[PDB]
Design a protein around this ligand. Sequence first.
Ligand code: CA
Ligand code: CA
Length: 281
Amino acid sequence: GSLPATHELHIFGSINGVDFDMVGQGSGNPNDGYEELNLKSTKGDLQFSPWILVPHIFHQYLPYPDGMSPFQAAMVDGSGYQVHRTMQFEDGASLTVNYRYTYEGSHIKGEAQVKGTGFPADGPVMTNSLTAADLGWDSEEELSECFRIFDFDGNGFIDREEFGDIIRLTGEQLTDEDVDEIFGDSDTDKNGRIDFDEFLKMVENVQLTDNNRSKKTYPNDKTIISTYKWSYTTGNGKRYRSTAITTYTFAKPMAANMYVFRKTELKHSKTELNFKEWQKA
Ligand SMILES: [Ca+2]
Ligand SMILES: [Ca+2]
């Protein structure tokens, strides 16, 4: 009958055939979408980047804009759900994370069974050289190429004239004054031109590239499939890209009655990690 306040996780399995096992406890705020979790290895030093466990490491904490998410609803009514998470990486590797949960009041006890295969032995996962994880495939380098296409006069800034052909990329029908408003809001230093730093922020604010799009489909009344593009930052700053497919199976049909803006942080040694997640208000 309760939304969650605390949780624990046992996450274990194998990566490239080598077993791992981690345990720990955390907490969160289901009204705001905040989570924090500590995990410790029980089998010695991790042999792979724990960033690949992100975002997998509790949607019972993650609300919708207008109220409870279906995941929260299924905890509150007791019926629950199970999760089959998959991630397909640009190098052919794959990761499966299967979740089950039990509830004791506002406490969630989670278990995630993991199987990762096909990671190159000398790549950033198996040598622990990832440094961040983010929704979407955009990089600053790819957005630089876009900026340069539309900077017609070549002066290093997007002016109001040049901005029209950029904002078209949303596909939305916008009046001249709709565009004026977006332009003004994007020109945060009020010099009449959009510089590259302002352009990066505009891309996120208007979802020019749909970088934060998270698509849900409902194959049947007990299933949600969430799918999205994902990336990790590597040691030379370049992106390591993947595709996520998460299938939720609910015990009871969901009640008859989009973009994701979350940040993650992971501090990690070989034996312990501290994870935090924040959802934009
Ligand atoms: Ca220009
Ligand atoms: Ca400006």
